[PDB]
């Protein structure tokens, strides 16, 4: 089966290098070339050139010509994406996608006909920070919000659930914003019976992986 | 470069419908042009290429049709695995370019804002710093406003706000917004409020709190 498999997700300082690898597997590389497009979050699709896959010709479109490096590794069955001197706007998504070399005549498509999963690149010099957890508490003034803020933490992502995975029923865990300071907040809230709230104990479970960070919040109504 | 201009951002429709998505070249591209599809959890596979071929297992209720510098690619009988994001893209010369994408939503009737306001925890007051959360929930259509109010003063680049997909099960959205104060300065104001403005919402809604009751 044709299947174009990315390396994982990159955390980088600004300056430094990354190097985003796509493996080809179930065709044979050589054969096809081999495209790289970039998606910043908010997601516009940008072509950033591609590498003859037959000779090792790349090719840059002109907004990527200087810090971007189109390689191949055969003997590997992957195509190569280094980006130097990061900057905190290359924070996108990158995927890798084949195209059926054009001949005349051909009968192939001339397209981007398989596609990578994409590479997330997140670039920062933020420090790696576990969040605070704070609270939503329901207002003593039917149905009852509630929900935990969930502050101050670097890298993304935190998960969030509600007694321990029991409660799903009107949860929203809203998208992290990043502040000023370079540290990401997120709330999660979940509405409830109004008059659930003297008897059911609710519990917001937040993990962060990257600072082995696990908080139970309890969150009651305030005396 | 051509430029390809996706003209409809967002688009509202129903299981069922017949769906159409335009796309506008910068100048004749002789039907180069590919259609790609972006799911919510951010993969991409080609549609259809030189206008109207329909990709190898790609369902039958996928077309496309134009010439020149006018494009559409059509959905017959929307069904829910096609609620995605579709991108034109010409291949008539270096660079590729792309179309900003049009993105699928699914048509309900309006629904208002449920709005519910949150003062800061003693616990975060202590460590200097006060966050204020104003929540709408469960609104349609995904378009809604709001103002934050301290003592009756507006307050404008001091908050930040996120929106969630569009609600798999009521195919609502909620929005959620974060209010930032030193504690000096949380403390130096007495009345908070959020409020609330929205199509489904015959007047705004107002919900406050008088910090320390």
């Known amino acids: 089966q044709i299947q174009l498999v990315q390396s994982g997700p990159e955390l980088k300082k600004p300056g430094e290098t990354v190097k985003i690898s796509c493996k080809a597997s179930?065709?044979?590389?050589?054969?096809?070339?081999m495209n790289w497009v970039r998606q910043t979050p908010g997601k516009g699709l940008k072509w950033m050139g591609w590498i003859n896959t037959d000779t090792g010709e790349p090719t840059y479109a002109d907004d990527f010509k200087g810090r971007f490096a189109f390689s191949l590794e055969t003997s590997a069955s992957t195509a190569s994406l280094q980006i130097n001197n990061l900057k905190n706007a290359d924070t996108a998504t990158y995927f890798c996608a084949r195209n059926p070399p054009y001949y005349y005549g051909t009968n192939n498509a001339e397209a981007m006909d398989y596609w990578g999963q994409g590479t997330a690149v997140t670039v920062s010099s933020a420090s790696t920070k576990g969040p605070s957890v704070f609270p939503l508490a329901p207002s003593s003034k039917g149905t009852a919000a509630l929900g935990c803020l969930v502050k101050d933490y670097f890298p993304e992502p935190v998960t969030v659930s509600w007694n321990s995975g029991a409660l799903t029923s009107g949860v929203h865990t809203f998208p992290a914003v990043l502040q000023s300071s370079g540290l990401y907040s997120l709330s999660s809230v979940v509405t409830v019976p109004s008059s659930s709230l003297g008897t059911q104990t609710y519990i917001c479970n937040v993990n962060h992986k990257p600072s082995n960070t696990k908080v139970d919040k309890r969150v009651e109504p305030k005396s | 470069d051509i430029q390809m201009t996706q003209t409809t951002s967002s688009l509202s429709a129903s299981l069922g419908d017949r769906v159409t998505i335009s796309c506008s070249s910068s100048?004749?591209?002789?039907?180069?042009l590919n259609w790609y599809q972006q799911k919510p959890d951010g993969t991409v596979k080609v549609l259809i290429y030189y206008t109207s071929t329909l990709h190898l297992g790609v369902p039958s209720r996928f077309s496309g049709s134009g010439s020149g510098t006018d494009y559409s690619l059509t959905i017959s009988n929307l069904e829910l695995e096609d609620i995605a994001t579709y991108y034109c893209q010409q291949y008539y010369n270096l660079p590729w370019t792309f179309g900003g994408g049009t993105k699928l939503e699914i048509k309900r009737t309006v629904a208002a804002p449920s709005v519910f306001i949150f003062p800061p925890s003693d616990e975060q007051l202590k460590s200097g710093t006060a966050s204020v959360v104003c929540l709408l929930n469960n609104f349609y259509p995904r378009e809604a406003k709001y103002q934050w109010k301290v003592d009756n003063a507006l307050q404008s680049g001091n908050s930040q706000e996120s929106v969630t997909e569009q609600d798999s099960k009521d195919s609502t959205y909620s929005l959620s917004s974060t209010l930032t104060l030193s504690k000096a300065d949380y403390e130096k104001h007495k009345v908070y409020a959020c409020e609330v403005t929205h199509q489904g919402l015959s007047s705004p809604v107002t919900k406050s709190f008088n910090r320390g009751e």
């Open positions: 179930g065709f044979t590389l050589t054969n096809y070339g």
């Open positions: 100048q004749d591209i002789s039907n180069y």
